[PDB]
Amino acid sequence: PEIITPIITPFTKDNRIDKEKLKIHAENLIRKGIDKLFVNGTTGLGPSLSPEEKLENLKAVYDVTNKIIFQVGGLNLDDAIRLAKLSKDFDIVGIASYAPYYYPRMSEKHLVKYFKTLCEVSPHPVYLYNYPTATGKDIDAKVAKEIGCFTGVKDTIENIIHTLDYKRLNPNMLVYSGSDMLIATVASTGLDGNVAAGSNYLPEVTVTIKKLAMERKIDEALKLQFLHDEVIEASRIFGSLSSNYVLTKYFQGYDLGYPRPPIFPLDDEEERQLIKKVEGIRAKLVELKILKE
Amino acid sequence: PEIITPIITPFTKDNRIDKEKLKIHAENLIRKGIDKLFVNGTTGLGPSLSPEEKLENLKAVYDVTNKIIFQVGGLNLDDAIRLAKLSKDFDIVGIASYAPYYYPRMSEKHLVKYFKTLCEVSPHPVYLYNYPTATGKDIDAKVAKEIGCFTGVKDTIENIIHTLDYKRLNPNMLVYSGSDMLIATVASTGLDGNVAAGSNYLPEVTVTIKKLAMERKIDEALKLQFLHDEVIEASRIFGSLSSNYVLTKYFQGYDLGYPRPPIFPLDDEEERQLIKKVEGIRAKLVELKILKE
Amino acid sequence: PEIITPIITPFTKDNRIDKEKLKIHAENLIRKGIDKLFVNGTTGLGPSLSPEEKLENLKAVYDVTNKIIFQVGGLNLDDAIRLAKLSKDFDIVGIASYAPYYYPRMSEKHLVKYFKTLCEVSPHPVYLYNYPTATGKDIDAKVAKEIGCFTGVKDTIENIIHTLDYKRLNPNMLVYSGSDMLIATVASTGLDGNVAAGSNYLPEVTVTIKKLAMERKIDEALKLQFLHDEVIEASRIFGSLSSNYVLTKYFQGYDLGYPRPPIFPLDDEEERQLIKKVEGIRAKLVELKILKE
Amino acid sequence: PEIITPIITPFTKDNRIDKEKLKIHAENLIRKGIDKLFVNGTTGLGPSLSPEEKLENLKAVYDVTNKIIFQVGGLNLDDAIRLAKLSKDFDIVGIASYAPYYYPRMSEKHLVKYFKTLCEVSPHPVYLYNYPTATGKDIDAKVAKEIGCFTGVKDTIENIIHTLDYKRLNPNMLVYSGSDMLIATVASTGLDGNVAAGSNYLPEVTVTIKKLAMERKIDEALKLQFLHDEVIEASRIFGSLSSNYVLTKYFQGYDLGYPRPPIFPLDDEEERQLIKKVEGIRAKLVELKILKE
């Protein structure tokens, strides 16, 4: 199994993508053993990015690595097709899309047509990003099999029965969980790994949970998983997508600038309070020899 | 109370806004007694429009009428602010925003800051568009009172107690329901009207229900309301946002082009089946002299 | 329209029904203008009562009035049939049942069979008690029509579109809301009234809201409804089913003993805090001459 | 880890517990390597049983084995206490309760008081049966820790993160999943076992999945788990609680009588459809030498 980072998009003080900070972060992740980068995902504020910005992200990250899954979806299918075709010139792992968001009660037929359209134009393998809470719909194992053209799926759902069903119905599909709290479990149970937001700021933790689980040291993997859980919980106090910026700077030592409002940056007091919540975990991770003092 | 149409955005065969068809539709709505037009709402595929397109819509409708509420929201707050400021040049009723959609677990503080930021830059009264199922969050009467700057609210929810609470906690606020099925009830219970997607295609019916209820002819209002409900139900069979185009052509006698994929147009057989479901209702409305033949 | 009280079951210190206290309460409600009493409902802790206790309740209340709807449902259909048959000797308004509770995902076929079975043995008109949050299932207007033997329905749901649909699909059916917060609206919009837990402790207020709305005095009805809403909210702080006992003693001046654990009685401090939350409302109600000192 | 069967309660034609069939079934399960029997759970229609019947089940099963966890909960706490106390004469594993069902919006304090009361009177270890969909409330890892007296938990929920959190916050608690579909995963990920309804009819399969997973033959375990999943899905088509009777007859060869209405037995057409869905699987299991005949 693999750990894949849904890489954060750093923004400047005037709300443009900070390409240089993005390259530094991508470089660090690969050097810490992250397998692939998922670009323009939720953690990277994909839905907040224009199609031009989604493409700018791909170009910046491609300067560092070809191990990229390029998320291209949105509510203008013409724009998503254009991004899919533009990716032809990039020797990457694949493209991906979440389901059309916002609109409630979209028919299965329309959801299927959206995805098959992307598959028909794609110059690369296509990955399903399934995220029912964010998009309002579920493209489950049965619907994925109907669509019939996915190389893999990232399933962001707490119900691992649903994630396992992709493998049951689609034995050749790569099946990843979008949970950070399921790294140990996913590795242990025969699935293909995790696309983990928290690997932006603790890539060494996420890779080590996976390694320990693979060695069948499940108790040691769970001890580490549970520490990582506490960091995820702390990130949720003030908003995880904002907090991820603060936590990357704290644990990794470089900054990723600003999020894009309405994902507002933490203020100084919130950042102080969050660091207070994770200080103790950092000390435990240093004692475990996962982080350097 | 008022009937407000969340106006359909007609798209051309090549997926651009058809300004001429939009003007023909807006004219017809105003002529048939609709109070105000809500532009770039769900029914108008607001979330599928770029900021430039949201402005193009405003410009087209504004050639017809000043009686506009201009929806401006989205996931790039700079773009929503720019649209709010640009509205200064238009003599319209107000601007509006739904809550930031897609991202789950957004903090109350960040939600409040989003709306307060728009209120601070707005040259017009600001209306809350509350739609929990579509956006994933609820800006309830309490949060609305804390935000403090709303002239009115459109509440799209399966819970009229929630809608009444805006009136209870904000006595001077205009409070509209986002449901076609609650026109009789809203008028009967002291609320301010309905922002009704079905008024795109049966403005005569929606205005008549409201009139009957204001005359205290509740049985007669209900009988008409219940007929309208059957049309609403028929529109949902193949997807209401797509079906609304077909129904407007059927009842109002002009074309509104296409929706924007992934809100796909109805195919020929779906259109045939939809018309079959409503043709008897059409005959009955013509026999009742609500529709002219 | 009518106000129907889902009458509280008073228990002794040793967890038996206090029949004499129940008779006091029932007499007061009727004398204060409540139209009918719904016995063994949620407010009466019906699911906590044995079949023998359900019958004891009917017998006690029948000593005071025959204006009774007798709730008989449960998870032993033989017991529910027995209670239904036993009611033949009581000249009451009807019997009622909620849907089988606890078990998730029971087929429509099985639900319809449960209700048709009760209808086939019933010596009285049968009323559907639909409460999806409590029972986990929804016997909607369509399923009610398929069952085809209900005289009326009490719909406990905040979605009034759902409640109106019973009238739309079953024009002869009596249709009541299970909400205290919808008395003004129900009365205004052509429905048949409310089965109102809060009418246990403020029957005067519920009857008055209904009267005001009937007289088309919608603003006065709403002002009173909104005051009643604050009492309902206060009751929810420590648990409504428990708080209803404290509130009845406070407003009506006799006690109703104890609830049945795990519906635990409020402690003295909780009772003191609840009283503090409602004493200002009591004062307004006195000044409006709705209550006497 | 363990496999625990929530044993089905067989009823006679006169709606009494069929003790002799119950005994034959319990003997078979123990003989086929089931670890423990969970008596009066959902699968045993516990909510449908009077306290007397709950005791009668315990006594019948105790004739066969002492490896029993005795579920005692319900909405009359005095009855639940009585059952807890009566268990003192039985040398069993533990007692259990689900949370008080039906009533929405019970306070955390009252739920905590319910469970602590049972712990105070229990002569045996106490197990939480957490089933939020059925009971309408969640007793999560934090509330379990607060209660502070559970020896174990059975978590029936679509959220393995939630189950893992009991281990994370209560490291010396036994933590079981209530899912048949997670036997391979539970064993792999360091959890304590599964209380699995499907083990009533395919105890051979459930025990073999667990063994393969323990041997770290995860792919072989998943292969067999995915066949078991197909049987579970089939059982849900017409209602699992009813289908469990038919499937026990079909796979183990003896019958378990009838369920208790409103859990109605499958009709002949439903039984035929159910068999058609599982006979291929039965053939597969015979070929794999998991089932003899």
PDB file of C-alpha atoms in Angstrom, chain A residues 104-111 113, chain B residues 230-247 259 262-278:
ATOM      1  CA  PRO A 104     -29.036  17.734  -4.541  1.00  0.00           C
ATOM      2  CA  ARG A 105     -30.809  14.706  -6.046  1.00  0.00           C
ATOM      3  CA  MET A 106     -28.819  14.440  -9.292  1.00  0.00           C
ATOM      4  CA  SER A 107     -29.841  11.282 -11.103  1.00  0.00           C
ATOM      5  CA  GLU A 108     -27.570   8.244 -11.302  1.00  0.00           C
ATOM      6  CA  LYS A 109     -27.829   8.491 -15.104  1.00  0.00           C
ATOM      7  CA  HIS A 110     -26.493  12.058 -15.067  1.00  0.00           C
ATOM      8  CA  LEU A 111     -23.688  11.178 -12.575  1.00  0.00           C
ATOM      9  CA  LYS A 113     -22.691  10.368 -17.876  1.00  0.00           C
TER      10      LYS A 113
ATOM     11  CA  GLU B 230     -48.143  17.456  -8.919  1.00  0.00           C
ATOM     12  CA  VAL B 231     -46.193  19.457 -11.515  1.00  0.00           C
ATOM     13  CA  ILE B 232     -43.302  19.865  -9.030  1.00  0.00           C
ATOM     14  CA  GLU B 233     -43.345  16.084  -8.449  1.00  0.00           C
ATOM     15  CA  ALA B 234     -43.344  15.417 -12.193  1.00  0.00           C
ATOM     16  CA  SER B 235     -40.329  17.744 -12.615  1.00  0.00           C
ATOM     17  CA  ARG B 236     -38.378  15.628 -10.115  1.00  0.00           C
ATOM     18  CA  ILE B 237     -38.724  12.331 -12.052  1.00  0.00           C
ATOM     19  CA  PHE B 238     -35.810  13.074 -14.406  1.00  0.00           C
ATOM     20  CA  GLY B 239     -34.192  15.856 -12.337  1.00  0.00           C
ATOM     21  CA  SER B 240     -35.905  19.156 -11.599  1.00  0.00           C
ATOM     22  CA  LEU B 241     -33.105  21.529 -12.706  1.00  0.00           C
ATOM     23  CA  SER B 242     -33.167  19.908 -16.146  1.00  0.00           C
ATOM     24  CA  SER B 243     -36.925  19.480 -16.222  1.00  0.00           C
ATOM     25  CA  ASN B 244     -37.573  23.177 -15.496  1.00  0.00           C
ATOM     26  CA  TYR B 245     -36.372  24.006 -19.033  1.00  0.00           C
ATOM     27  CA  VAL B 246     -38.817  21.587 -20.649  1.00  0.00           C
ATOM     28  CA  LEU B 247     -41.712  22.779 -18.471  1.00  0.00           C
ATOM     29  CA  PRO B 259     -28.872  23.581 -18.871  1.00  0.00           C
ATOM     30  CA  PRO B 262     -23.458  17.990 -15.651  1.00  0.00           C
ATOM     31  CA  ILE B 263     -26.968  19.287 -15.373  1.00  0.00           C
ATOM     32  CA  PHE B 264     -27.749  17.487 -18.625  1.00  0.00           C
ATOM     33  CA  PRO B 265     -30.796  18.301 -20.806  1.00  0.00           C
ATOM     34  CA  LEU B 266     -33.670  15.816 -20.915  1.00  0.00           C
ATOM     35  CA  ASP B 267     -33.521  13.471 -23.893  1.00  0.00           C
ATOM     36  CA  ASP B 268     -36.436  13.115 -26.277  1.00  0.00           C
ATOM     37  CA  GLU B 269     -38.081  10.235 -24.477  1.00  0.00           C
ATOM     38  CA  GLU B 270     -37.731  11.874 -21.023  1.00  0.00           C
ATOM     39  CA  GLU B 271     -39.317  15.044 -22.419  1.00  0.00           C
ATOM     40  CA  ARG B 272     -42.135  12.959 -23.915  1.00  0.00           C
ATOM     41  CA  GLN B 273     -42.697  11.163 -20.632  1.00  0.00           C
ATOM     42  CA  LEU B 274     -42.608  14.407 -18.607  1.00  0.00           C
ATOM     43  CA  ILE B 275     -45.147  16.100 -20.887  1.00  0.00           C
ATOM     44  CA  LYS B 276     -47.383  13.046 -20.536  1.00  0.00           C
ATOM     45  CA  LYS B 277     -47.327  13.522 -16.773  1.00  0.00           C
ATOM     46  CA  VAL B 278     -48.404  17.174 -16.965  1.00  0.00           C
TER      47      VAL B 278
END
